[PDB]
């Protein structure tokens, strides 16, 4: 075969030091109360668990004719295999969903972004998955109907009782969480742009009505007040931080100034209402730089979120889609009447999914920004 051994040797040699460092970094992120540290820690643990058994396989392909270890060794490798294959999908999905909640509903779902909750979610995911794939251990009939005990591969022919289970495993274990990841990504872009659908309308309302007041007053001020109030609501769509406290304050000042201009417009003093409206320029000019600095710290944060969502989609598509396509085709090729090309490609493609164990740790450079910190550490070590 040659290719499988080469890929597996590469995955062990790179993935083990890499996953050990990634696990340490995830722990450090958890200690900092970064909710994404738990999912990354669970992925790193699932990976280290998977990798530690792979050398026996590799040895089988490199130096031995058959499975000298006995049938007992195929049950655990397979189980472990399927575990690694799915757990990493379930956690990549959990990460994408968490990020969408963090962007689309920052306050209504704040209770779901605590570390304790992420831990409970991890516990539920592990117990549910491990249970779902635990049956072949309880009973053997399956394990024998699906595998040739003399070599840890699945029978070239397949029987029912599993012919449909493989479809269940592709529709629920792949298409479902993948569609959820794509939907999460779309939802993030829509919420963000829609966050570009409310403030620009408010800024234009305020700026153009002010232009009207200076040339024309009650009507323009009435519209400005409504826009100013909605701009505060936008401030409150985000969690508290000193800049949000300051923007709400700035708006209370702006609204009060609009009200003084209205008082004068109601009295009927156009010149005075206009002079009062001009103080809205003095006020907005006090917050322009703050707003601009604040948005830059946003565009970069959104860039990181979008890149993470896209990277997760690309990881699932490249590492797992080839097997789920060949597995679905292989099952489909049996629901009735080339055969050998499907097998050959499927078995080569089964080695490919082991690359998830190398791509995963890369996510640490996207989640936080301690990537730069680690680079500095390495430079210092040098």
């Amino acid at each position, epitope marked *: 075969h040659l290719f499988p051994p080469s890929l597996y040797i590469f995955v062990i040699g790179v993935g083990l030091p890499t996953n050990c460092l990634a696990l340490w970094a995830a722990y450090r992120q958890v200690q900092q109360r970064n909710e994404l540290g738990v999912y990354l820690m669970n992925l790193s643990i699932a990976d280290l668990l998977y990798i530690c058994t792979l050398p026996l396989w590799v040895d089988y392909f490199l130096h031995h004719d058959n499975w000298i270890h006995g049938p007992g060794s195929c049950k655990l490798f397979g189980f472990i295999f399927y575990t690694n294959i799915y757990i990493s999908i379930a956690f990549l999905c959990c990460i994408s969903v968490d990020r969408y909640l963090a962007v689309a509903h920052p306050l209504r779902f704040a209770r779901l972004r605590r570390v304790k909750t992420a831990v409970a979610v991890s516990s539920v995911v592990w117990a549910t998955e491990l249970g779902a794939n635990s049956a072949p251990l309880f009973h053997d009939e399956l394990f024998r109907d699906r595998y040739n005990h003399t070599f840890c591969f699945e029978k070239f022919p397949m029987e029912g009782w599993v012919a449909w289970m493989n479809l269940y495993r592709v529709f629920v274990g792949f298409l479902f969480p993948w569609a959820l990841m794509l939907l999460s990504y779309r939802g993030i872009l829509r919420a963000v742009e829609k966050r570009r659908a409310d403030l620009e309308d408010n800024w234009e*309302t305020l700026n153009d009505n002010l232009k009207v007041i200076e040339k024309a007053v009650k009507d323009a001020l009435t519209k400005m007040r409504a826009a100013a109030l*909605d701009a505060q609501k936008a401030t409150d769509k985000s969690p508290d931080s000193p800049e949000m406290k300051d923007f709400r304050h700035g708006f209370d000042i702006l*609204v009060g100034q609009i009200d003084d201009a209205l008082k004068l417009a109601n009295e009927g003093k156009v010149k005075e209402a206009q002079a009062a409206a001009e103080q809205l320029k003095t006020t907005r000019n006090a917050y322009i730089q703050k707003y601009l600095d604040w948005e830059r710290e946003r565009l970069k944060r959104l860039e990181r979120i979008k890149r993470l969502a896209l990277s997760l989609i690309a990881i699932v598509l490249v590492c797992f889609a080839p097997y789920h396509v060949l597995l679905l085709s292989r099952s489909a090729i049996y629901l009735g009447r080339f055969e050998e090309r499907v097998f050959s490609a499927y078995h080569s493609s089964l080695a490919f999914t082991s690359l998830n164990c190398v791509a995963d740790p890369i996510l640490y450079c996207l989640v936080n920004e301690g990537a730069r910190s680690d680079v500095a550490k390495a430079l210092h070590n040098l």
Partner: antibody
Amino acid sequence: EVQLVESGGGLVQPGGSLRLSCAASGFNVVDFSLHWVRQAPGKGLEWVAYISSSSGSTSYADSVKGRFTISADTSKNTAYLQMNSLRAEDTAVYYCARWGYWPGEPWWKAFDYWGQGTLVTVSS
Amino acid sequence: DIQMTQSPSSLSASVGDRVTITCRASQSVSSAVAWYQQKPGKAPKLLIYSASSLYSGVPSRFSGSRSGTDFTLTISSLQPEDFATYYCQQYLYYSLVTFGQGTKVEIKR
């Protein structure tokens, strides 16, 4: 206890006048804006007048401009609505209501407290 | 000048039934719409303020929301005590206060 208590309604002939009162308890008149809301028999609610004694700001619905005067005297914790030159169309129940000042919840919460209302009937 | 229009001027519903009252602003109004419940002979009581939040003391049966200029009041399950006239009110400014015409919830028969 938070109360708004209206008084001074009754029967007036067209062209005549009434002085309605709105006494406050719990809160002072100067602590909030007072509004009069009118409800003609069988009709929905109409805003009529506003006073903010903390700023000296008043306003009126177009239907009563130059006809009604709104004032308040915080030393008795009481507000008043002076209704001059009344027309038949001014028959209604007049309610006094409390709406606080911007910023914050006292403003977003609008007419949280209403008084009992008093009937003004204008008829020859 | 900021008119509010309530659509279901009369709504019939059973006790335990779901009631939705829709109100439309003529122009943009921030979430500054309140809902009031008036029973015959009584001053209106505030139910919902800021087009969302309940006023303390108001049953959880009541809720509402804003979608652009469209505001709604929902009674998740009518109780015998909820057959009242509901009013939609706009509060952008002290002098601009307007009310919708009111919608009456009647007992279905």
